[PDB]
Write a protein that binds this ligand. Structure first.
Ligand SMILES: Cc1cccc(O)c1
Ligand SMILES: [Cl-]
Ligand SMILES: [Zn+2]
Lengths: 21, 28
């Protein structure tokens, strides 16, 4: 999930944007 | 994990900012 990718390591905004609608 | 709880709080503010008009669903 997003908590596993982005809380174990620091996501970028391009990455975060994957989880948008 | 309290650290994840804290992290998630920041994640949703980030989603809010990046997703904009699109919006988003948060599903831990
Ligand atoms: C913007 C943001 C907040 C928390 C974790 C991350 O990987 C990224
Ligand atoms: Cl924090
Ligand atoms: Zn904090």
């Amino acid at each position: 999930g997003i908590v596993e990718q982005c809380c174990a390591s620091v996501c970028s905004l391009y990455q975060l944007e994957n989880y948008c609608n | 994990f309290v650290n994840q709880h804290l992290c998630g709080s920041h994640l949703v503010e980030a989603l809010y900012l990046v997703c904009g008009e699109r919006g988003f669903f948060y599903t831990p």
